[PDB]
Amino acid sequence: TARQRVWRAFENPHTSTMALVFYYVTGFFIAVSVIANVVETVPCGSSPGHIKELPCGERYAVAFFCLDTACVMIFTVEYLLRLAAAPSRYRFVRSVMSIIDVVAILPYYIGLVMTDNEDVSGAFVTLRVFRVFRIFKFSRHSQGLRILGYTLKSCASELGFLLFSLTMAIIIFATVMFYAEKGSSASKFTSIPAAFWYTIVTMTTLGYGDMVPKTIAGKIFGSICSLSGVLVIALPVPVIVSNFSRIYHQNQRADKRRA
Amino acid sequence: TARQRVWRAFENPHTSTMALVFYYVTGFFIAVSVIANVVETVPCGSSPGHIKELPCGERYAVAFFCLDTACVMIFTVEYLLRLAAAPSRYRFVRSVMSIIDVVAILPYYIGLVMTDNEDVSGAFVTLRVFRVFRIFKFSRHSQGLRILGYTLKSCASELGFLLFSLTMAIIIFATVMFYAEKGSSASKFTSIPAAFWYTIVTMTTLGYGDMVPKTIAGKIFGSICSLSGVLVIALPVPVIVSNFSRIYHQNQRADKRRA
Amino acid sequence: TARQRVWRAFENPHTSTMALVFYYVTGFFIAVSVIANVVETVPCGSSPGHIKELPCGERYAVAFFCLDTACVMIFTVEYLLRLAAAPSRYRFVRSVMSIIDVVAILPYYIGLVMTDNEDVSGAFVTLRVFRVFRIFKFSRHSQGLRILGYTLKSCASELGFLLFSLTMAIIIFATVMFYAEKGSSASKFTSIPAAFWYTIVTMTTLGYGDMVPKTIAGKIFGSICSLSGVLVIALPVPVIVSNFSRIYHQNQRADKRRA
Amino acid sequence: TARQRVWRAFENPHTSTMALVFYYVTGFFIAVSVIANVVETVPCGSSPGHIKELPCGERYAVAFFCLDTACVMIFTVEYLLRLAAAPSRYRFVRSVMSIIDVVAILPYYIGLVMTDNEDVSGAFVTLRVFRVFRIFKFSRHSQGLRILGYTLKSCASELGFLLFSLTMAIIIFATVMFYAEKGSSASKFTSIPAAFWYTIVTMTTLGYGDMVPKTIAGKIFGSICSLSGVLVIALPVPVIVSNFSRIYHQNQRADKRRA
Ligand SMILES: [K+]
Ligand SMILES: [K+]
Ligand SMILES: [K+]
Ligand SMILES: [K+]
């Protein structure tokens, strides 16, 4: 019963005070690691003996490294204990949660085994972009009433269909806008993939304004794209609202049929 | 009886006629204070002897000071009339509108007790900002503002967690976008907090365009971010309208139970 | 019965072939006058003997004036016949339709009585801005199933309330942004009315990008304003949808209870 | 029987297996043609002897011409197989998908009959634009595209009149905004059609910001225009979702009547 006790402590933290406090402690380290990751890019001032101000992640290299290694030791101990007290270890590993945990904790170890190649370029940048995966664990720790998740998986069909229609519309409008605008002077529409950016920014009603049409045909088709973008942003709202209300009432019905 | 008579004159001023008069007088004074606050920052111009065109609040500082102190005298006397006529002084003081009144009137007296050093900087700006909360006193003049407050109080936990998830998505997108765009030339994505601005502007479908991606990876993730903004537009609507409908329907049921 | 015949020809065009053709003819002149008004501002090319290319409204002054006077004679004859065949002439005049008709036809006559002051400035510009009022007549001629109008007048209460809340939010956010951003260099937030523009452009999720925050406090409050703008644009959709469906079903119910 | 056997193989290719094979082959060829069209505009670069980096469509024009003519040979033979196996040649030819097929394949043969003069300019761009309508042939591969087409055909008159009203509002706002902003310095509101661009960009809540108001009156009317864009976002949703629900519910009723 010891292994089942540790497991029921893990996926049901509220049962035991010690389980609850371990839950809150690992949540706190996830939060501090996320905040440290965000902070270690902020350029600290006073530029001590440097041509340009160094970010807090290079000026205080050892401090942020010690904080990172404390967080990663906590995460690794968590994952090892979960792998121990898992009833079906293979099924536990196959869960997307363990995948996220391992791909979040790996960057630290992979950087530690490449300290000799400290002058590496490009690869470590992606490696430590994957250090943003700890926010996923943090979102998991707030596993409140996920009516929104149920609504999203209820609407998944129409959302994927809208994504496919949006892809077709993006390709069509990008072709049209590129051919209308390839001939302008210093034109930003240098290719159809280049016009993909303008199209996706227009159909979402961003309009950054870096790429704008400069020709009458380009402006006509940009207007058509704008209207289709109005439709794009507007359509999901009523159906998401309806599905949310439906699942909400369904959950109260389930609660009452449990009483 | 005078205490409770004045109280009833206050919270149901439609019963009496002098109470309605005082109601409309204090509403007028609130409007006057708000309009004076807005206008006194407008550059009046045409001021000889000063190269910089002073605002109407410094060229005619005497008139605006007299107007604001008259408005705050009205607010102070009406607040003391509320307090003196309350059946329960503690309950009224703890009530949110009392906090609104006190946060509206305290800045003037704080400026009075600070005026010994007219060279105050950094604090007077905060006082001026808090001088706008006199507009919140219009809730007493609008059942719509009361029902909006009740709706927001109902949408407390769920909008809180929705904002938490939005913040988590902002952190994720800011991380990926900073690391995609830190290396560009004269880049504005100088840190992850710096890219917080781009992420929040994109996820809301503003697209100021002041800072836009310039790399292929940055543009791919900006496209994903805007597409997620399409869902950001629709996410709060279900729960906001559901809570509003709940409040409205219990109001209807209560009004029918009255009949 | 002659006057009632002319009236029933006017407000019920489909009855008589001659009534229908007069309806279509006056619709066609409204369309041609609108198109002429739009065109007479387009700068025609070839710049014949001019420092700068003249618009089609000054190069062909007589042609556009003759087209305008033909349209205005048709409109005046229409309005005179309506005033004749009106059963209650005073009530007919008091209708907003006759107000729009007279304020649309007046610009021509008022310009004709001020041809001596052909060098007038400013006033005639507004006078001929009111020449855009003919589009209102044109929209009237398409008096199809106005379920949208009924829905809008059904939602008028909540729409006005949302407008009032938007006004309060604009004033509050403008005060906050101006005080956060008055101190920047070459700042566009030179007053609270100046920040009205930024606020209204942000809460509607336009983000032109001419006025953007440049300070950390300004960016924080611009983010709050952006989120409130998401709420602003998102909220009307479900309620308009519900009201539209309700009135739609009500209209089919009315049609069937008429059968 | 061969005619009808092949026909059934075409419009219900799930029945057979060789029909499913030909189905997936032609879907693959449609995807290949679309991707080739997009890619061949991308500047390949690294081309010695040419200062301008040619697109992949001119550096490797032979490969892309062979690929496109192979795709169009497949399209031509499959179209002639549809036509030859149709029970009713006229009904099939008049059917919209036949128009899609012919408008997809005609540009290639028009280019073939134009190739005697390879210096064609202005027409070849139109042919290239119409070469994207091969993407529409994916409707045969998506029940979602068919139901979207049915919905749009249902939302024919009402969206038409909604677009008419939107155009009328665009004309009104463009008139007032041009006359508010014609007098500014280096103004981009050079005509009412010039302000059509600003009006459509603002009413859709894009706000590129390329052309923004610079006058107080221009800013007031731009605020009104954006506020109207808030309604523009919500206007088509009721009728679009109502018609979609009608189509979906009659589909459900038919499928139940099957059982
Ligand atoms: K928008
Ligand atoms: K912009
Ligand atoms: K926008
Ligand atoms: K924008």
CATH label of the domain that carries residue C55:
1.20.120
Do D52 and D73 belong together in one domain?
yes
Residue A220 domain-assigned (yes or no): yes
Chains in touch with D (≥3 Cβ pairs < 8 A): A, B, C
Contact C207, D226 (CB under 8 A): no
Which pair of tokens denotes residue B66? 């007299």
* Cα distance between residue A49 and residue A63, in whole Å: 19
Q: Which of B196, B182, B170 is nearest to A128 (CA)?
A: B182
Residues near B227 by beta carbon (within 8 Å), at least 6 away in sequence = A200, A204
CB contact under 8 A, A208 and B207: yes
Q: Is D153 exposed, middle or buried (0-12, 13-18, 19+ CB in 10 A)?
A: exposed
Which pair of tokens denotes residue B37? 């606050």
Do D105 and D163 belong together in one domain?
no
Which pair of tokens denotes residue D97? 């998908």
Model resolution, angstroms: 3.0
Residue C71 domain-assigned (yes or no): yes
* Cα distance between residue C1 and residue C87, in whole Å: 11
Residues in chain C within 8 Å Cβ distance of B241? 235, 238-239
* Cα distance between residue A227 and residue D202, in whole Å: 11
Contact C244, D242 (CB under 8 A): yes
Residue A41 in marked binding region: no
Q: Is C112 exposed, middle or buried (0-12, 13-18, 19+ CB in 10 A)?
A: exposed
Which pair of tokens denotes residue A216? 């009458």
Do D48 and D73 belong together in one domain?
yes
* Cα distance between residue B8 and residue C239, in whole Å: 37
Q: Could you tell me which residues of C are annotated as the binding site?
A: 205-208
Cα(C34) to centroid of ligand 4, in Å?
30
φ/ψ of B39, rounded to 5, equals: -70, -35
Contact D247, D147 (CB under 8 A): yes
Q: What is the DSSP letter of A53?
A: P
Which pair of tokens denotes residue B18? 């002098």
Amino acid (one-letter) located at B77: V
Do B161 and B86 belong together in one domain?
no
Q: Is B79 exposed, middle or buried (0-12, 13-18, 19+ CB in 10 A)?
A: middle
Do C123 and C180 belong together in one domain?
no
Residue C259 domain-assigned (yes or no): no
Q: Which of D191, D207, D235 sits opposite C55 (nearest CB)?
A: D191
Question: Which of B227-238 are b and which e, b meaning 16 or more Cβ less than 10 Å from the residue's Cβ?
Answer: bbbbbbbbbbbb
Residues in chain A within 8 Å Cβ distance of B198? none
Do A125 and A167 belong together in one domain?
no
What's B112's domain CATH number?
1.20.120.350
Residue A207 in marked binding region: yes
Do D190 and D219 belong together in one domain?
yes
Residues near C99 by beta carbon (within 8 Å), at least 6 away in sequence = none
Cα(A205) to centroid of ligand 4, in Å?
7
Contact B76, B105 (CB under 8 A): yes
What's A206's domain CATH number?
1.10.287.70
* Cα distance between residue C234 and residue A149, in whole Å: 20
Residues in chain C within 8 Å Cβ distance of B135? 168, 171-172
Q: Tokens 């409908």 map to which residue?
A: B245
Contact D209, C208 (CB under 8 A): yes
Identify the nearest ligand to the CA of A210 by its number.
2
**HSE of A243, CA atoms in CB hemisphere, 13 A:** 20
Question: Which of B44-75 are b and which e, b meaning 16 or more Cβ less than 10 Å from the residue's Cβ?
Answer: eeeeeeeeeeebbbebeeeebeebbeebbebb
Q: What is the DSSP letter of B35?
A: H
φ/ψ of D27, rounded to 5, equals: -65, -40
Local structure of D152: helix, strand or coil:
helix
Which pair of tokens denotes residue D129? 């634009």
Residues in chain B within 8 Å Cβ distance of C172? 132, 135
Contact C66, C32 (CB under 8 A): no
Do B13 and B86 belong together in one domain?
yes
* Cα distance between residue B97 and residue B103, in whole Å: 10
Q: Which of D202, B210, D211 is nearest to A214 (CA)?
A: D211
* Cα distance between residue D116 and residue C108, in whole Å: 57
Cα(C97) to centroid of ligand 4, in Å?
37
Residues in chain C within 8 Å Cβ distance of D219? 197
Contact C135, C34 (CB under 8 A): yes
Nearest chain B Cα distance for residue D192, angstroms = 25
CA A184 vs CA B147, C46, C94, D59: distances in Å: 54, 22, 54, 22
Nearest chain A Cα distance for residue C42, angstroms = 13
Nearest chain A Cα distance for residue B182, angstroms = 10
Neighbours of D126 (CB within 10 A): 12
Residue C137 domain-assigned (yes or no): yes
Using the 3D structure, point to which of A141, A160, A181 is the last residue of a domain.
A141
Q: Which of D192, D233, D238 sits opposite C38 (nearest CB)?
A: D192
The dihedral region occupied by D119, where left means phi > 0, alpha psi between -120 and 50, and beta the remainder, is alpha
* Cα distance between residue D225 and residue D228, in whole Å: 5
* Cα distance between residue A179 and residue D50, in whole Å: 22
Using the 3D structure, point to which of D141, D172, D192 is the last residue of a domain.
D141
**HSE of D213, CA atoms in CB hemisphere, 13 A:** 27
Query: For residue D50, what are the domain limits?
Result: 2-141
Q: Which of B185, B162, B169, B186 is nearest to B221 (CA)?
A: B169
CA D168 vs CA C139, C159, D32: distances in Å: 8, 22, 42
Which pair of tokens denotes residue A173? 């409008």
Which pair of tokens denotes residue A191? 């290719």
Contact A7, A89 (CB under 8 A): no
* Cα distance between residue A234 and residue B27, in whole Å: 38
Contact D41, A191 (CB under 8 A): yes
Contact B135, C171 (CB under 8 A): yes
Q: Which of A207, A208, A238 sits opposite C238 (nearest CB)?
A: A238
Q: Which of D105, D124, D98 is nearest to D30 (CA)?
A: D105
* Cα distance between residue D141 and residue D24, in whole Å: 9
**HSE of C46, CA atoms in CB hemisphere, 13 A:** 4
* Cα distance between residue C202 and residue D74, in whole Å: 52
Q: Which of B161, B219, B234 sits opposite A236 (nearest CB)?
A: B234
CB contact under 8 A, D207 and B205: no
Do C158 and C206 belong together in one domain?
yes
Q: What is the DSSP letter of B60?
A: T
Do B116 and B41 belong together in one domain?
yes
Q: Is C48 exposed, middle or buried (0-12, 13-18, 19+ CB in 10 A)?
A: exposed
Do D84 and D195 belong together in one domain?
no
Do A104 and A166 belong together in one domain?
no
**HSE of D258, CA atoms in CB hemisphere, 13 A:** 6
Q: Is C32 exposed, middle or buried (0-12, 13-18, 19+ CB in 10 A)?
A: middle
- Determine which of D53, D135, D189, D206 to mutate to test the interface with A (most A C-beta atoms within 10 Å): D206
First to last CA, chain B: 31
Q: Is B33 exposed, middle or buried (0-12, 13-18, 19+ CB in 10 A)?
A: buried
Local structure of B43: helix, strand or coil:
strand
CA B162 vs CA A134, B150, C119, D104: distances in Å: 19, 18, 61, 47
Q: What is the DSSP letter of B155?
A: T
Using the 3D structure, point to which of A84, A112, A141 is the last residue of a domain.
A141
* Cα distance between residue D13 and residue D25, in whole Å: 12
**HSE of D47, CA atoms in CB hemisphere, 13 A:** 14
Contact C174, C195 (CB under 8 A): yes
Domain count along chain A: 2
Q: Could you tell me which residues of C are annotated as the binding site for K(+)?
A: 205-208
Residues near A165 by beta carbon (within 8 Å), at least 6 away in sequence = D144, D145, D148
